[PDB]
């Protein structure tokens, strides 16, 4: 849901620039214990309301693993690297489930974001980081009903600055 990002330090916003047409994204997430979760998404703007259409194919999750056992815990915050390739944006991140009792199960996200505008109509951002805080705040039911919050920030590596003027 990449329309909701706070970009700092003047980093251009590929997602907000893509409206009113919108954008798509595509991703495979590879889990360290062998699972794969692949998705394709379309984002459109219908009047004042954003509309998401998502297709998912997941496979090879181990029967004895946290995912198929529904013993996943909660996501740690994560940081994505985002950069231009082939006139579109690529993203990659490492995410980690903090499982009950302390072990982390990690995964690697491989994403392409595709504006519906031609690249010539867009100011492309340089290489930067996108922090994502994802919290499943309410398990209303099962199984069946969930409330999820996200905060996201697009930024450079400010904590360890360049001695040469690089971002």
């Amino acid at each position: 849901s990449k329309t909701f990002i706070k970009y700092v330090s003047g980093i251009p916003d590929y997602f907000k620039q893509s409206f009113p047409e919108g954008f798509t994204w595509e991703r495979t997430t590879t889990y360290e214990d062998g699972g794969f979760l692949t998705a394709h998404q379309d984002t459109s703007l219908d009047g004042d309301c954003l509309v998401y259409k998502v297709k998912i194919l997941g496979n090879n999750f181990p029967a004895d693993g946290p995912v198929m056992q529904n013993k996943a815990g909660r996501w740690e915050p994560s940081t994505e690297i985002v950069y231009e390739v082939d006139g579109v944006l690529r993203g990659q991140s490492l995410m980690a489930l903090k499982c009950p009792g302390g072990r982390h199960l990690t995964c690697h996200l491989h994403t392409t974001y595709r504006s519906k505008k031609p690249a010539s109509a867009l100011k492309m951002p340089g290489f930067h980081f996108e922090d994502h805080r994802i919290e499943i705040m309410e398990e209303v039911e099962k199984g069946k009903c969930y409330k999820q919050y996200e905060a996201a920030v697009g930024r450079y590596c400010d904590a360890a600055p360049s001695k040469l003027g690089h971002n």
Binding site: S1, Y52, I136, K142
Partner: protein, 64 residues
Amino acid sequence: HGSASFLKKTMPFKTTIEGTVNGHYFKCTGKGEGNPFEGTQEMKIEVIEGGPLPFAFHILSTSC
């Protein structure tokens, strides 16, 4: 835009999710709202087919 007084403070969204994980088919709908420039959002997701999910919802968090 001059100042933040001229930006949309909040924007709603709706979602439909359909998929198959380890052979298990499911469909979801969701509704939410966020603050585009503050970068915060929340949504409610409901499983409408294939519930209760036989796997952790967490694998769907980055997709909804």
